[PDB]
Amino acid sequence: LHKEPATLIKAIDGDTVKLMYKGQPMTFRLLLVDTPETKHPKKGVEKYGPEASAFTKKMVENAKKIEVEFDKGQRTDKYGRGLAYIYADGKMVNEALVRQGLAKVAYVYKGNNTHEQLLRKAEAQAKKEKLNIWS
């Protein structure tokens, strides 16, 4: 995989960020994670959804460098969002969320599984520590 530079435009949700990527604005869905949503069709505000959202926002808003890493499977979803791992000062946001107990690992989507093990390990640890969603 190759890390590419991007610039924050806006963090939308725990699982979604809008970035400037190769000169054009684009919505990115973070790969392999499911966060509680703030912008859910029904249920509206799920528990820990506002915590996950603020976590993602804080991480990308305070970074001096954002990088996007596409995986080797499909790169956009049916809503047009890019499917990627996002890094803030070298730290993977997708992993930080799971490790903090603020997301679960999602099922693999269309060949995109490069960091699944890494993430599943982070999740097991968060469950063991009974953090946040796992409390």
Side-chain angles (χ1 to χ4, degrees):
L1 307 193
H2 165 238
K3 284 173 198 200
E4 307 163 65
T7 307
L8 189 69
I9 294 167
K10 158 181 307 326
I12 295 313
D13 220 355
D15 71 0
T16 305
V17 294
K18 194 171 321 179
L19 304 176
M20 190 84 28
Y21 171 68
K22 263 108 234 264
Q24 94 287 307
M26 222 183 111
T27 301
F28 280 87
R29 165 69 161 86
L30 280 51
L31 270 169
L32 282 168
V33 307
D34 289 315
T35 49
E37 342 250 302
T38 65
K39 220 112 224 220
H40 199 303
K42 237 329 128 228
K43 306 128 154 211
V45 153
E46 317 171 84
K47 191 185 88 324
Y48 286 109
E51 276 71 18
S53 295
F55 184 97
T56 291
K57 176 173 174 70
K58 238 52 51 213
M59 227 182 131
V60 291
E61 276 179 9
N62 298 294
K64 356 183 250 182
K65 298 187 226 207
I66 304 273
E67 294 165 303
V68 155
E69 184 180 58
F70 286 97
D71 205 333
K72 59 98 182 3
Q74 295 181 25
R75 275 138 197 200
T76 62
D77 71 8
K78 48 171 128 86
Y79 295 104
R81 299 179 295 184
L83 298 176
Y85 308 102
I86 305 264
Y87 294 79
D89 293 325
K91 179 151 166 65
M92 197 199 302
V93 179
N94 314 49
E95 190 190 352
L97 285 162
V98 175
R99 178 61 179 95
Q100 206 82 12
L102 291 173
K104 8 233 256 171
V105 173
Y107 328 95
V108 160
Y109 184 81
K110 283 297 198 311
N112 287 319
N113 60 4
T114 295
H115 297 307
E116 196 197 4
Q117 288 305 84
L118 184 93
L119 282 187
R120 261 155 225 260
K121 285 184 162 329
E123 188 191 59
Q125 190 62 50
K127 302 193 206 128
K128 191 166 82 204
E129 297 177 0
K130 296 192 110 225
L131 285 191
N132 288 316
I133 63 162
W134 304 108
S135 193

